[PDB]
Amino acid sequence: IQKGKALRGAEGDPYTIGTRRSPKPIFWVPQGGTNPTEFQNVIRAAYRQ
Amino acid sequence: KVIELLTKHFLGRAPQDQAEIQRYNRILAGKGLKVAIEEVLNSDEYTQLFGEDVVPFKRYPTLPTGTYLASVATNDEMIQQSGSSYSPSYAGYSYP
Amino acid sequence: TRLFKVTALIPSYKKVRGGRELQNTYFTKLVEYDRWFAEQQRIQKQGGKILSVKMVAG
Amino acid sequence: MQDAITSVINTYDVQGKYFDTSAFDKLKAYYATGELRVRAAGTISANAATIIKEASAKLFSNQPDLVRPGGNAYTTRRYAACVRDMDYFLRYATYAMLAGDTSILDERVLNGLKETYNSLGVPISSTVQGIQAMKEVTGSLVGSGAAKEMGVYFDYLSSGLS
Amino acid sequence: MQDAITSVINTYDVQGKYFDTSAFDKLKAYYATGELRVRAAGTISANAATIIKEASAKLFSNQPDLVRPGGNAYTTRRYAACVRDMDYFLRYATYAMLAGDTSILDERVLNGLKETYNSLGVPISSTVQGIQAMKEVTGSLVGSGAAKEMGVYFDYLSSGLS
Amino acid sequence: MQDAITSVINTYDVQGKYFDTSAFDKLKAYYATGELRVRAAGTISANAATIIKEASAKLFSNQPDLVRPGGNAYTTRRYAACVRDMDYFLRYATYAMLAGDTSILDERVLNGLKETYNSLGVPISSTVQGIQAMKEVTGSLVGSGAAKEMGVYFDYLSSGLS
Amino acid sequence: MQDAITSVINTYDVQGKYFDTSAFDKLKAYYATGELRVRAAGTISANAATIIKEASAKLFSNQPDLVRPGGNAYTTRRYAACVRDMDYFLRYATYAMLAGDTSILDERVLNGLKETYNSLGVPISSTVQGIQAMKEVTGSLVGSGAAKEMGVYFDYLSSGLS
Amino acid sequence: MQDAITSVINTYDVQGKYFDTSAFDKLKAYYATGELRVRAAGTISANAATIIKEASAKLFSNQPDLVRPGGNAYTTRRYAACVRDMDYFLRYATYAMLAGDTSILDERVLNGLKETYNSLGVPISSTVQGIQAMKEVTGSLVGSGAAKEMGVYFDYLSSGLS
Amino acid sequence: SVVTKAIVSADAEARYLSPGELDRIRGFVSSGERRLRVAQTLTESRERIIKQAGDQLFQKRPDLVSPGGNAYGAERTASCLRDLDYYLRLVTFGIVAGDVTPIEEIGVIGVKEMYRNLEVPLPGMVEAVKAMKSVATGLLSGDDSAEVGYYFDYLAGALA
Amino acid sequence: SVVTKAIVSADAEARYLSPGELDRIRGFVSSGERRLRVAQTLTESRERIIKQAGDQLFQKRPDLVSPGGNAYGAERTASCLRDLDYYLRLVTFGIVAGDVTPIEEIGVIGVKEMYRNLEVPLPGMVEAVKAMKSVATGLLSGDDSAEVGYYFDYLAGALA
Amino acid sequence: SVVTKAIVSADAEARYLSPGELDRIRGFVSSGERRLRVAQTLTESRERIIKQAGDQLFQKRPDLVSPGGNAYGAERTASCLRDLDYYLRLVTFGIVAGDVTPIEEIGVIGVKEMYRNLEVPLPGMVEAVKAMKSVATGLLSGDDSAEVGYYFDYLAGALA
Amino acid sequence: SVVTKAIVSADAEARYLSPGELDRIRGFVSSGERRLRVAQTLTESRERIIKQAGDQLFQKRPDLVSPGGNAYGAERTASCLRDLDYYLRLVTFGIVAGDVTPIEEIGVIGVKEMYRNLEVPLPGMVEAVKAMKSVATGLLSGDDSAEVGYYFDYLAGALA
Numbered sequence A: 001i002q003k004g005k006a007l008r009g010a011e012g013d014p015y016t017i018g019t020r021r022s023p024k025p026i027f028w029v030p031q032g033g034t035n036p037t038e039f040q041n042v043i044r045a046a047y048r049q
Numbered sequence B: 001k002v003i004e005l006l007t008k009h010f011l012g013r014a015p016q017d018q019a020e021i022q023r024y025n026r027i028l029a030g031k032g033l034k035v036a037i038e039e040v041l042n043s044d045e046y047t048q049l050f051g052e053d054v055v056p057f058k059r060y061p062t063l064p065t066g067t068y069l070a071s072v073a074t075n076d077e078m079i080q081q082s083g084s085s086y087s088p089s090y091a092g093y094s095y096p
Numbered sequence C: 001t002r003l004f005k006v007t008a009l010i011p012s013y014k015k016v017r018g019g020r021e022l023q024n025t026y027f028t029k030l031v032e033y034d035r036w037f038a039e040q041q042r043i044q045k046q047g048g049k050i051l052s053v054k055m056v057a058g
Numbered sequence D, E, F, G, H: 001m002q003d004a005i006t007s008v009i010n011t012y013d014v015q016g017k018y019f020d021t022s023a024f025d026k027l028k029a030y031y032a033t034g035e036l037r038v039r040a041a042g043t044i045s046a047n048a049a050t051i052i053k054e055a056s057a058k059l060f061s062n063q064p065d066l067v068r069p070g071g072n073a074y075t076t077r078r079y080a081a082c083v084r085d086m087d088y089f090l091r092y093a094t095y096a097m098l099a100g101d102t103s104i105l106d107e108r109v110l111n112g113l114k115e116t117y118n119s120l121g122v123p124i125s126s127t128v129q130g131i132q133a134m135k136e137v138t139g140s141l142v143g144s145g146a147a148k149e150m151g152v153y154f155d156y157l158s159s160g161l162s
Numbered sequence I, J, K, L: 001s002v003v004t005k006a007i008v009s010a011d012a013e014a015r016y017l018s019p020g021e022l023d024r025i026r027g028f029v030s031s032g033e034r035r036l037r038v039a040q041t042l043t044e045s046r047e048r049i050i051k052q053a054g055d056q057l058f059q060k061r062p063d064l065v066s067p068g069g070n071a072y073g074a075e076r077t078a079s080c081l082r083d084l085d086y087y088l089r090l091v092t093f094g095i096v097a098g099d100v101t102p103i104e105e106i107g108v109i110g111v112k113e114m115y116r117n118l119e120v121p122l123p124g125m126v127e128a129v130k131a132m133k134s135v136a137t138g139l140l141s142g143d144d145s146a147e148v149g150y151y152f153d154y155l156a157g158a159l160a
């Protein structure tokens, strides 16, 4: 219990801060069958990028 | 600025170094926009990050030095220019 | 001239990739003329083999 | 972005603490308001075009100088971009209301927005007027309990712009 | 990709017909199997590394020549590619089992896999025996009831290769 | 790409044995020819522009209809393509000679080139004649001992394109 | 990037001068230490994982708050990035030692490092202490003659960050 | 693509010849039709939406089961793709009419269209009937001479489908 | 459906489904009988829903069935009612699916181009959808009408 | 959490949340009290869980605490137990969150590099979190035990 | 090999080899005879190197051949010694080639995933490779010992 | 304008303007007096054109100016006529510029979004623009009538 104690107090670093992350949802068009809504999503993502 | 926008839109990135600027400036001065686009898209970096099927996305690369901060400033930056050259808007009130 | 229809297989030799990349390994696409030399040379330098080359238009 | 739950998780993680009675109180408070938030988000999403219509009509009625020749809302392109920005504000306010927290606003809307508008020539006072108008339009449809919560995020957008 | 529910929806859509007793019965069957499917998916996801270890060990004990020099699995790269393919088959079979259809197996796995192995030199029969080893290991794990449900999609993959 | 050294290494790796006297003899042979190969490659690098100069000159003198209207090499564009292909053949033949192996010709020259020429209608006979012209010009400059070695890879290219 | 040889070349090239006796003396001084630099670089490459492990251990022992909850190195995310940064510092210090110049450190490590860490919240003094930890761990392994040479580049990094 | 002028230029360039009397006669014939082609193209562009609406209404009135459930045009997605294809055919017929050459059709519409429609299940006969309906509407709008010119490319599209 | 969305999300990251996704699918399958009863109620009374909704639509906008209107005549009014029936079927499909993907894929992607090429006013469609929403939610209890309203509101927003 | 996942998915597509997403959020907030009592129960019994899980870990794997083992000695054993305590805290966070996101991003991303730098065997992690699973699902009822075990299984798979 | 890497680098810029790469190949082929002598001395020393390295490994790490260990048992110890034999052959290949490319391509790409699937402790790999380095370096002269130790250090770094 | 189009096309290719582009500019500037005459004629007849076009629009669509119409009342009818004036001004700008680019990017891009937000029916705009076409082309001579008609056709099609 002693070895897990926070030493910077409430003025510590949460996980949210630090380095910036890329968008977690990765858009791709799979070879083969593709749903229409997912295709529209990918196309909108490409135009947005 | 066009080079920086190219890297932003198709590599999700800021320009890595001055060598990238020199290469793409030489391409833009000689051949135009299409050849610069094909240079960005035929790059090894593009095929290693997005391959053939992944939409390019915002990245914040750890290396080289200064590229992470530049990429943060780049991917954060929204469009700053008016969308048309016709009919500019002006600051000024009409009082009722 | 005009378009090519190129089929090539690009294996992976530098790493073992965790995504699926079946489509990045085997792929048939249309490559129009003024880019085909560069694309063929990149496929060759990636270690991939070109399976077929066809002239669709021209 | 972070919601109320992840905000409590942050507060207790930076301290290396398990959840206390106050943490469970805050989590109860968020869970209690969940159905209200879901209903309000459904209502807003149902009437987004309507809300934007009243908000834009009020803004351009109070300030006809935006849509006169030489205003920042004068062209079909710039009128469309204005109502598009109002769509942005409404949708992200709905996101923040569902999250119970204003982090998504700061990260996705307000970050660099003031300088972006200044470079575009977009009037920020008029944008705050449009956001406020959208607040009164939305509050009537969502209801008093939902309106009080939704006005928090609308006022957050207005203060961030100011 | 397609689910059982989406499959019924598409069948009744191409007819332009509303749902009837048969469609409702099929949907009820899927809903009844749903909790079993979720339990099997969780059990498999928890033990994916163990399933792959046991199945690959069984395959390379039955066919040791694959990993001695000259075998298609002789190098660290090629062995890693083999166990990676086993991971693919297990994960996509789990996806198909949750879905209740094999459409994902056709679209995202078997689309050009046979000729890819042919050009690479991968022994398709040995890969099928590896899939069979995964089927046995997974059936020993999820239980008797979910074993046949999993083996349906494992056999679909095996027949797709062969 | 594999050279002579890598060729021997892979030959012994697929068998799982260590280097024997035959392997060491092949390695000694390649090391003995290494200095001659480096000298030849340097000489060829020095004269590559002149070699392509003279080889294309002889090819178009022997087949004047190639560069005259209606010929495959009739335009500034197609003539540039011809001399570019000749450049690439010369450089890759130099690579192959320096390596001591003909693989690089397989994966980086003949990898889909015959299909491309057939699709475009490039005359294979005229291409072989141009390669022979490069062979003749190169052998005159490099020296007989290395001219014979360059002949192997030039003949490999001619046979592959045939 | 610049090394000692390239630094001399650029110094004489900005003046349009051929090499003089002082330049040749400097080049001799570099070629005399080349073997020691190569041996030290190989020694670092052999022990890089070890050096990083003991250096990070001693750093987090002297500053426990870094890896306790709320610390900048507290999450597997941030801990991994921290030891990754120390690996970067070791690798680039080895580069600078091998090149005999600190130009690579300036233009590939220190250029914008301070305000990068400032935007991140990384404690720069703790990074300096970790770099000192790596220097102390490395000096024992390399040996005093190599220890001084590696220490000048470690001190360059520490002074640039400080 | 190539137009009539570019076709003549290509012919005389491959022949290696300067322009002759017959070439100048063909050029005069093409120049003499320029104003008629421009007027027809402007009329078609001004009325393209009307032509598409009338032709699609005719096609779906003659074949109602194309857009009823089970037809190839049954969904808003399928209907949209159908009318978009009709717009493509009209626009490309107008381009080919302006150029005086059917090439642009070959290399930009008809290449692979039969295979694409056979793989998708698009009825070729119904597509031909839609093209003929556009032909009738366009000929009604543009007048007799312009309809005679446009019918060449409409028939070319219909024939290249089959 | 819900399962398809969860699987596609997991596959985009090349991972197995997390406990959150599995819990979502568990909640979906646990609620299957309720949405099935809702869909059966909607389909067993579809003729009444279509007739009434057409009645409110024509009351609100008589110009549609007036001379010069798009729905004037027996056949055109029949086409209008048949479109309403189409969208009622799509709403039932969405109910059983757990999301609006069937509606989005059969009746929304390209609907603006469809109704533009057909000279059909989109606000007319929006208010017809609103009428179907009112009539259909009339048949169901408050709890069931609650979720059915979201699907109908999605359809109205998509047309608008 | 569940709300964050739904909002991020709706934002990456630049749309409002779907009726299904609102339904999953409704189900998540409706089940908040039960998962909240689950987290309460696991939090009250931190010390017993950690002590028993450490005992089973060291009995199953004596080599970890034997001389030359990574957890050899009192202080390294305490570091072992406080890592287990970290992960129990993350599991409670995930239980209240409704997804494994807190676990994923506090104790999974970069866990391999962290434990490689520390000479900590990842298998040892796996049986440690399995033992903590056994102890922690011992104290809970069957449904709560299954719900918690899903998170522990996710953690064990992440370390594996 | 040195020639392979130089040619690939030259082909990267689509150019002939520069004086640097040519002199590099010259210096490589000039030293081929002593490389072959070293590779021999490693080759005929088969059993001494392998058995001594395995003995020292099992002496320093008794857990591997102790009950419950990865290499416990006669067949598993045979597999351990066989892996060591594999890597010694790879080191001789890298010696003759002049780079680590044979070692890398045959035994380094994917080795981590391979030994993870085989539940083989990578620190055991590193200790075995250090044992092989010590034994093989003992049999060679100092100039050759340094070069061979470089390849063994590369292998240890790849495993660690 | 024509010159701006040529310059941006040349600039996208990093080149000077080709003889074809310079010939296009030459032909454009040789016809400037005709374009200015046409624009001046359309400017003089501005009030007449707007008056007759509005009258033709309203006599076909009495509901628009009746109680409950979009343009009901003096102020809303004035806004109607003001929009017609906007578009006539844009057509004059297009004539002097030699292209529809001023029309396009002052009053076409986002016009459907704008009029949808205003609840202004697009068919009313299309019919009003057709009326303006008829009235304006009546005033000009035939050769100028065709030119003005092209711009009005572009506007009417873009609004449709």
Ligand SMILES: CCC1=C(C)/C(=C/C2=NC(=C\c3[nH]c(/C=C4\NC(=O)[C@H](C)[C@H]4CC)c(C)c3CCC(=O)O)/C(CCC(=O)O)=C2C)NC1=O
Binding pocket: A017, A018, A019, A020, B060, B061, B062, B063, B064, B065, B066, B067, B068, G066, G072, G073, G077, G078, G079, G081, G082, G083, G085, G086, G088, G089, G092, G108, G109, G110, G113, G116, G120, G122, G123, G124, G126, G127, G130
């Ligand atoms: C080769 C030159 C170079 C360096 C050095 C460099 C460092 C660097 N460190 C970063 C983040 C970081 N860096 C650290 C470093 C640690 N924080 C602890 O307190 C320690 C005091 C300290 C190291 C001893 C941490 C904790 C992060 C945050 C990682 C995260 O948020 O996940 C980032 C942001 C991007 C990323 O991590 O992927 C960079 C670019 N980048 C470069 O191009």
Ligand SMILES: CCC1=C(C)/C(=C/C2=NC(=C\c3[nH]c(/C=C4\NC(=O)[C@H](C)[C@H]4CC)c(C)c3CCC(=O)O)/C(CCC(=O)O)=C2C)NC1=O
Binding pocket: B078, B079, B080, B081, B082, B083, B084, D066, D072, D073, D077, D078, D079, D081, D082, D083, D085, D086, D088, D108, D109, D113, D116, D120, D122, D123, D126, D127, D130
């Ligand atoms: C989701 C976060 C986000 C925001 C907030 C955002 C705002 C934004 N508005 C923009 C343009 C614009 N925004 C407006 C809106 C203004 N004009 C009127 O006067 C009003 C006072 C006011 C709106 C109520 C206008 C007219 C433009 C067009 C500017 C131009 O084209 O010159 C632009 C430049 C690129 C573009 O969209 O055309 C941005 C980045 N973008 C984002 O990604």
Ligand SMILES: CCC1=C(C)/C(=C/C2=NC(=C\c3[nH]c(/C=C4\NC(=O)[C@H](C)[C@H]4CC)c(C)c3CCC(=O)O)/C(CCC(=O)O)=C2C)NC1=O
Binding pocket: C011, C012, C016, C017, C019, C020, C021, C022, C023, C025, E066, E072, E073, E077, E078, E079, E081, E082, E083, E085, E086, E088, E089, E092, E108, E109, E110, E113, E116, E120, E122, E123, E126, E127, E130
């Ligand atoms: C998700 C759908 C999917 C599948 C199924 C898939 C399989 C697949 N396996 C590959 C290679 C491979 N696959 C294997 C596996 C074989 N070796 C043994 O003999 C076994 C019998 C058998 C496995 C059980 C091996 C050894 C390779 C390496 C081939 C080489 O590089 O020479 C490759 C080429 C790319 C690479 O080397 O990483 C693919 C695309 N990829 C996909 O995206």
Ligand SMILES: CCC1=C(C)/C(=C/C2=NC(=C\c3[nH]c(/C=C4\NC(=O)[C@H](C)[C@H]4CC)c(C)c3CCC(=O)O)/C(CCC(=O)O)=C2C)NC1=O
Binding pocket: C001, C033, C034, C035, C036, C037, C040, C041, C044, F066, F072, F073, F078, F079, F081, F082, F083, F085, F086, F088, F089, F108, F109, F110, F113, F116, F120, F122, F123, F126, F127, F130
């Ligand atoms: C590095 C390996 C490699 C090579 C060499 C290669 C050659 C190659 N030659 C091409 C065309 C061509 N190649 C030639 C040259 C031929 N015709 C002449 O008469 C001669 C007989 C002969 C040369 C000695 C010509 C004239 C063309 C133009 C064909 C056309 O445009 O129709 C093309 C089509 C794309 C382009 O021209 O940009 C390729 C890819 N590709 C490769 O990946």
Ligand SMILES: CCC1=C(C)/C(=C/C2=NC(=C\c3[nH]c(/C=C4\NC(=O)[C@H](C)[C@H]4CC)c(C)c3CCC(=O)O)/C(CCC(=O)O)=C2C)NC1=O
Binding pocket: H057, H060, H067, H068, H073, H074, H075, H076, H079, I064, I070, I071, I076, I077, I079, I080, I081, I083, I084, I086, I087, I106, I107, I114, I118, I120, I121, I124, I125, I128
């Ligand atoms: C399931 C997806 C789907 C839909 C929705 C669909 C609609 C559709 N409605 C049509 C006709 C029609 N649809 C309507 C309905 C309109 N009348 C009023 O204005 C109302 C606002 C509105 C109905 C509420 C009318 C009047 C017609 C006849 C138009 C004509 O005769 O040209 C047609 C042309 C062929 C036919 O008569 O069936 C289609 C394709 N098709 C599809 O595959």
Ligand SMILES: CCC1=C(C)/C(=C/C2=NC(=C\c3[nH]c(/C=C4\NC(=O)[C@H](C)[C@H]4CC)c(C)c3CCC(=O)O)/C(CCC(=O)O)=C2C)NC1=O
Binding pocket: G060, G064, G067, G068, G073, G074, G075, G076, G079, J064, J069, J070, J071, J072, J076, J077, J079, J080, J081, J083, J084, J086, J087, J106, J107, J114, J118, J120, J121, J122, J123, J124, J125, J128
């Ligand atoms: C919240 C996410 C997080 C985790 C999990 C974490 C773990 C962590 N464990 C550490 C030490 C340790 N961790 C262990 C645990 C191992 N001992 C046995 O081998 C077992 C296999 C295993 C326990 C089940 C041990 C023994 C040490 C001491 C290492 C040493 O001092 O040399 C350290 C080094 C810093 C310090 O001791 O303060 C970290 C950062 N840090 C984090 O920010």
Ligand SMILES: CCC1=C(C)/C(=C/C2=NC(=C\c3[nH]c(/C=C4\NC(=O)[C@H](C)[C@H]4CC)c(C)c3CCC(=O)O)/C(CCC(=O)O)=C2C)NC1=O
Binding pocket: E060, E067, E073, E074, E075, E076, E079, K064, K070, K071, K076, K077, K079, K080, K081, K083, K084, K086, K087, K106, K107, K114, K118, K120, K121, K124, K125, K128
């Ligand atoms: C040429 C490149 C190459 C390598 C290196 C390679 C290693 C390798 N070793 C294996 C087995 C094994 N390898 C070991 C060795 C370990 N035991 C102890 O932990 C030691 C620390 C360590 C040896 C130094 C053991 C014990 C097994 C048996 C695993 C089992 O039966 O479960 C296997 C599985 C198939 C088999 O039984 O042979 C492979 C693929 N394969 C290759 O194609």
Ligand SMILES: CCC1=C(C)/C(=C/C2=NC(=C\c3[nH]c(/C=C4\NC(=O)[C@H](C)[C@H]4CC)c(C)c3CCC(=O)O)/C(CCC(=O)O)=C2C)NC1=O
Binding pocket: D060, D067, D073, D074, D075, D076, D079, L057, L064, L070, L071, L072, L076, L077, L079, L080, L081, L083, L084, L086, L087, L106, L107, L118, L120, L121, L123, L124, L125, L128
């Ligand atoms: C230069 C590009 C440009 C255009 C074209 C433009 C049009 C425009 N018309 C508007 C109002 C209006 N526009 C109309 C016209 C319509 N009423 C009938 O339905 C007819 C079909 C049709 C006229 C032919 C009417 C009646 C209003 C008043 C609506 C109201 O006050 O409720 C408004 C709202 C602000 C205002 O009242 O002035 C704009 C911005 N604005 C621009 O910046």
